[PDB]
């Protein structure tokens, strides 16, 4: 969306056992709206004036990557319906006024449009566009054989999606390489941090 980003994962990915969903920049009003709809989420990271003071501790990390919200189980279905019927997904004033949120996926779906990443070699090779983890893993797998296990990579990251690495704990037909499935079915080690430099020497990985 133009304010927040969500990531739905299947059952088994990232060490989980049920379908999950992660919303990084959540606000107090949006969370309260979620509570009044049956969603059971869990953030892992004047008397009315006194109530505002209590909310001040709650409203400190809003609009910041520390307000990540994790939804699990069958609540993802109600989350989907709520997001479809929400009134703040589409901006009503500004440059992105009326534009619906963008959907990204590694496999085809109803209404999808096949796209391609731009590759250009200068030795160096440059690839631009929305890079998803399976694309990066496949690229590394190819370059390992092509470059005889010797290359270095510089990764530029989209900051508002770095908190998705927060730990949360039969995929043969998902349409992914078995090595990629094995890699993605691990436990998230990084926290609020993303890879910035990857180096491979003599078929050994030393990430920075």
């Amino acid at each position: 969306t133009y304010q927040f980003t969500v990531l739905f994962r299947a059952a088994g990915l990232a060490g989980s056992d049920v379908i999950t969903a992660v919303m990084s920049p959540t606000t107090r009003g949006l969370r309260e709206a979620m509570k009044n709809e049956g969603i059971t989420f869990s953030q892992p990271l004047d008397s009315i004036s006194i109530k505002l003071r209590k909310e001040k501790n709650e409203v400190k990390l809003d609009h910041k990557p520390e307000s990540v919200v994790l939804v699990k189980g069958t609540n993802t279905f109600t989350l989907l319906n709520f997001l479809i019927n929400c009134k703040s997904i589409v901006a009503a004033a500004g440059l992105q006024a009326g534009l619906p949120p963008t959907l990204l996926s590694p496999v085809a779906f109803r209404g999808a449009t096949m796209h391609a990443l731009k590759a250009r070699s200068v030795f160096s090779l440059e690839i631009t566009g929305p890079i998803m983890p399976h694309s990066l893993h496949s690229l590394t797998m190819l370059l390992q054989s092509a470059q005889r296990g010797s290359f270095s990579a510089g990764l530029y990251t989209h900051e508002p999606t770095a908190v998705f690495n927060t730990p949360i704990h039969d995929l043969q037909n998902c349409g992914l390489h078995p090595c990629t499935v094995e890699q993605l079915t691990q436990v998230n080690e990084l926290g609020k941090l993303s890879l910035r430099h990857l180096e491979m020497t003599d078929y050994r990985y030393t990430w920075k």
């Binding site: 009003g29 009503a92 004033a93």
Partner: protein, 262 residues
């Protein structure tokens, strides 16, 4: 107007702070509960969420004020239709930090005309609170018809000199009777602010500025008070016979009166 429509949309989006931290959604509910028709909008929030509107309001107060008032009316009608039906038009007052518009009666030049300013001074005189006419409802006994009419003057926004006040005859010269209980009236008061005596250059007389208060802004301060008025700065054209001297006087419409000493 397309620009006015865009301003109205953006202001209505700003006011409906529901799925965000519920500040100005709670404020509107509080205003409705307390039976008021003026909302004090801090423009620090507007600048934080939409800087272009904040600057445009600081430099062109008239159209932006009209758009903001209409957006507030729409939001109130959304919250409660009957309350919106009670009041013809809602008012908006501003506060916060203005920047280079924080002036005094001495530094209030003629280049600030039409700009939302915030004047600091000490009151010197206040007039009496006399009523003013906005809408009059007439009735014709012969035809059993109820007539209505709207008035305006030059000392209000959307200024227009309106004549033929209190009509007495219909189209066919039928007698007309005015129903005073059905007409709408509002208060009116005139004040004067003076530059602080401690910050006035020696020898020269202190400067002054005349302000206009209306509705709930009347009887908010007395002579001898340190105040801080916020409102639009405008000229009053003067016409004598068929001639205009060209030396118009300046007035300061007010939308928020705040004391300092308290």
């Amino acid at each position: 107007d397309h620009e006015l429509r865009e301003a109205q949309r953006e202001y209505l989006d700003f006011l409906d702070d529901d799925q965000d931290q519920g500040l100005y959604h709670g404020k509107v509910r509080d205003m409705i509960g307390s039976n008021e028709h003026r909302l004090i909008v801090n423009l620090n929030d507007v600048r934080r969420k939409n800087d272009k509107r904040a600057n445009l309001m600081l430099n062109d107060a008239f159209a932006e004020t009209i758009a903001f008032q209409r957006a507030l009316k729409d939001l109130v009608a959304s919250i409660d239709a009957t309350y919106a039906k009670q009041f013809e038009e809602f008012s908006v007052g501003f506060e916060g930090s203005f920047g280079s518009k924080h002036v005094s009666p001495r530094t209030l030049t003629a280049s600030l005309l039409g700009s939302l300013v915030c004047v600091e001074g000490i009151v010197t005189k206040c007039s009496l609170v006399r009523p003013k006419v906005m809408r009059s409802v007439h009735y014709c006994p012969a035809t059993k018809k109820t007539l209505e009419r709207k008035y305006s003057d030059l000392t209000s926004l959307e200024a227009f000199p309106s004549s033929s006040i209190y009509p007495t005859k219909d189209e066919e010269n039928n007698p007309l009777e005015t129903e005073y209980g059905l007409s709408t009236y509002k208060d009116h008061q005139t004040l004067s602010i003076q530059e602080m005596p401690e910050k006035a250059p020696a020898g020269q007389l202190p400067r002054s500025v005349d302000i206009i208060a209306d509705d709930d802004l009347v009887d908010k301060c007395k002579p001898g008070d340190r105040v801080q008025i916020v409102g639009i700065y405008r000229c009053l054209p003067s016409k004598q016979g068929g001639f205009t001297s060209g030396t118009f006087r300046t007035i300061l419409l007010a939308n928020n009166i705040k004391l300092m000493s308290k």
